[PDB]
Amino acid sequence: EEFRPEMLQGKKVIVTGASKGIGREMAYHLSKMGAHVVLTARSEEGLQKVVSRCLELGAASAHYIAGTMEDMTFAEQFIVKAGKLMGGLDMLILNHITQTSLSLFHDDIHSVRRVMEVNFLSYVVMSTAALPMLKQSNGSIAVISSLAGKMTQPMIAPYSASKFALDGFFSTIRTELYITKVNVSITLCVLGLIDTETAMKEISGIINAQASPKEECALEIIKGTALRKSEVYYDKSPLTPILLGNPGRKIMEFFSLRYYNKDMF
Amino acid sequence: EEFRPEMLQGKKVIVTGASKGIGREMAYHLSKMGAHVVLTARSEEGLQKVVSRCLELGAASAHYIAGTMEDMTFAEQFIVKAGKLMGGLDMLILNHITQTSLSLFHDDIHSVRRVMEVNFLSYVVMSTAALPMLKQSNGSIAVISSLAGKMTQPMIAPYSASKFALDGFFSTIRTELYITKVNVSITLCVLGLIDTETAMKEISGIINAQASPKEECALEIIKGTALRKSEVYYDKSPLTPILLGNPGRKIMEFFSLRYYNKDMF
Numbered sequence: 447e448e449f450r451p452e453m454l455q456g457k458k459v460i461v462t463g464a465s466k467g468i469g470r471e472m473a474y475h476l477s478k479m480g481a482h483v484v485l486t487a488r489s490e491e492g493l494q495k496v497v498s499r500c501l502e503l504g505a506a507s508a509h510y511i512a513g514t515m516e517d518m519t520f521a522e523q524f525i526v527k528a529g530k531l532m533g534g535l536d537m538l539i540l541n542h543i544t545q546t547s548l549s550l551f552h553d554d555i556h557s558v559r560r561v562m563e564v565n566f567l568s569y570v571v572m573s574t575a576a577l578p579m580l581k582q583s584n585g586s587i588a589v590i591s592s593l594a595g596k597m598t599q600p601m602i603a604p605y606s607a608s609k610f611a612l613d614g615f616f617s618t619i620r621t622e623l624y625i626t627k628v629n630v631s632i633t634l635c636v637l638g639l640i641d642t643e644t645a646m647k648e649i650s651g652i653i654n655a656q657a658s659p660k661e662e663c664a665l666e667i668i669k670g671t672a673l674r675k676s677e678v679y680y681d682k683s684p685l686t687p688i689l690l691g692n693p694g695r696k697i698m699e700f701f702s703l704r705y706y707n708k709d710m711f
Numbered sequence: 712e713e714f715r716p717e718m719l720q721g722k723k724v725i726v727t728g729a730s731k732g733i734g735r736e737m738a739y740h741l742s743k744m745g746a747h748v749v750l751t752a753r754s755e756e757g758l759q760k761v762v763s764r765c766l767e768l769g770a771a772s773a774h775y776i777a778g779t780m781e782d783m784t785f786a787e788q789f790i791v792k793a794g795k796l797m798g799g800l801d802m803l804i805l806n807h808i809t810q811t812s813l814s815l816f817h818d819d820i821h822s823v824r825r826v827m828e829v830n831f832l833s834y835v836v837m838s839t840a841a842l843p844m845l846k847q848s849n850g851s852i853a854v855i856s857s858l859a860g861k862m863t864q865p866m867i868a869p870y871s872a873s874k875f876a877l878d879g880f881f882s883t884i885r886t887e888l889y890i891t892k893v894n895v896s897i898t899l900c901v902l903g904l905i906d907t908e909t910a911m912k913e914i915s916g917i918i919n920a921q922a923s924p925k926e927e928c929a930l931e932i933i934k935g936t937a938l939r940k941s942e943v944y945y946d947k948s949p950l951t952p953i954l955l956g957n958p959g960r961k962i963m964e965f966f967s968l969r970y971y972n973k974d975m976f
């Protein structure tokens with residue numbers, strides 16, 4: 447199976463955190479492929495610029511709904527509104543996160559909660575609300591994560607906890623959908639350092655690593671999700687996918703199912 | 712180095728989720744070794760029975776403070792009170808969990824939030840509140856997890872997400888303590904199916920597998936934490952630790968540290 451930009455022509459796609467960074471780049475790529483898109487983020491001014499650029503790029507349709515993912519009711523209602531605007535949904539791309547800064551963890555529990563709320567909870571809420579429509583189109587969900595969701599590095603404990611949580615939850619959902627024969631795919635995207643101005647600003651004077659181009663990253667996420675792959679790794683080093691792939695875990699998961707009462711699903 | 716019960720003689724230890732299961736068995740073990748102990752759980756009546764048995768068993772002292780870990784203030788204050796009571800803290804064992812039954816996930820968002828609150832948030836709250844005392848005695852922290860915190864299995868998405876989150880948060884904390892030269896150890900205990908009433912009852916008719924004895928499990932957790940091991944695996948199969956150990960991750964974490972500005976530590 448090889449990718450062809452035709453696979454997204456006419457598709458109905460939602461993209462969160464599309465105001466800038468990887469999100470904005472995915473909007474552009476989806477637009478050049480003739481897809482229908484609905485974007486979201488906090489700033490209405492920023493969303494308007496990208497939506498304009500989207501039609502200008504060939505988007506079969508482009509719209510935006512500004513709001514904060516800290517509000518679960520908004521996250522939930524966002525999905526249904528987007529669904530109505532496009533008359534369905536083929537692909538959901540959960541990409542947004544809350545403002546994170548690098549620092550050794552001290553206290554600030556309220557910060558950890560906000561991180562788990564926006565980075566994790568809003569994702570389960572949106573995926574839950576979008577599943578009905580996704581089941582109708584045998585759609586897909588792309589969950590944006592990072593190396594920090596597969597490994598540990600200092601100064602990002604909260605962020606790291608939220609990304610690990612995403613793997614735990616959605617990997618379970620993926621196998622439940624598959625075990626109950628529902629044709630909806632879940633692609634976890636493991637991203638290394640990307641040259642977004644947010645990232646660069648944040649690791650300045652702290653991290654030395656080389657960053658990858660945000661445009662190609664955006665493309666690989668689209669490709670892997672359209673190809674219904676379980677996981678997509680994108681990092682400068684070709685060793686990252688092999689060192690973080692965890693083949694031992696795959697073996698354990700396969701054999702674990704043999705203990706379940708097959709009548710439960 | 713090898714373990715010797717004398718390593719806990721006189722040690723000041725906190726154990727959550729101590730009214731039953733593995734937590735109760737840990738209380739009995741710490742007691743026989745002559746440790747000071749303060750237990751917690753929701754059942755006041757239940758805690759009473761165990762603290763009494765602890766004194767009989769030979770505890771240097773034993774107290775209990777009933778409460779719900781769904782309350783972040785009760786969680787942080789439980790640690791301060793317990794600390795005052797023993798005059799310090801040597802070991803913190805985070806073992807409590809909110810209720811969860813096996814079931815294919817659907818849309819129980821309030822449950823998910825509750826699970827992350829109890830299973831994860833309260834844990835960071837307590838570890839934060841306890842760290843100052845642990846720093847004075849170069850103490851340890853044991854965070855109880857399960858196979859579901861290293862791998863994925865159907866019907867426990869919420870639980871699994873909270874356990875993955877613990878790995879991400881605490882492995883970061885562990886490495887941060889280490890690079891700043893603070894001598895406090897963090898032991899993640901990965902448990903297979905344990906022979907507790909709650910477990911056996913919850914998997915009935917759903918999962919058919921062999922469980923390990925709760926008493927030996929408790930003893931291994933204590934020995935591992937006492938020896939300051941980073942991780943402890945306790946399961947039927949001797950292959951489990953190897954398959955879930957993720958050596959690739961350990962390699963990636965080692966190499967990534969090289970890109971950090973050591974002045975920040």
Ligand SMILES: NC(=O)C1=CN([C@@H]2O[C@H](COP(=O)(O)OP(=O)(O)OC[C@H]3O[C@@H](n4cnc5c(N)ncnc54)[C@H](OP(=O)(O)O)[C@@H]3O)[C@@H](O)[C@H]2O)C=CC1
Binds near residue numbers: 640644
């Ligand atoms: N850049 C990198 O190096 C790496 C990035 N990633 C992953 O990429 C994804 C995007 O990263 P990146 O492009 O760098 O991030 P950005 O900060 O550039 O983008 C974040 C997006 O989320 C939106 N947003 C921020 N706060 C909230 C909120 N409370 N509610 C709703 N929306 C919000 C932003 O719009 P607005 O602020 O206007 O709301 C923005 O469009 C994430 O899931 C991230 O963890 C992974 C590895 C590396």
Ligand SMILES: NC(=O)C1=CN([C@@H]2O[C@H](COP(=O)(O)OP(=O)(O)OC[C@H]3O[C@@H](n4cnc5c(N)ncnc54)[C@H](OP(=O)(O)O)[C@@H]3O)[C@@H](O)[C@H]2O)C=CC1
Binds near residue numbers: 779805810858903
């Ligand atoms: N048994 C097994 O197969 C396995 C167990 N484990 C791990 O072991 C630990 C507990 O072991 P297990 O014996 O199975 O669990 P149990 O359900 O038997 O014990 C749970 C403990 O948590 C307490 N608890 C329950 N609800 C709350 C709450 N809202 N606030 C504070 N405390 C609460 C209980 O006290 P009370 O009800 O009075 O509040 C009890 O003392 C967990 O951390 C778990 O993930 C891991 C893998 C397998």
Ligand SMILES: CCCCCCCC
Binds near residue numbers: 904910914920
């Ligand atoms: C969550 C308790 C069940 C774990 C099942 C283990 C199958 C090897």
Ligand SMILES: CCCCCCCC
Binds near residue numbers: 594639653655
């Ligand atoms: C915030 C994530 C930084 C990743 C740096 C590690 C490079 C392999």
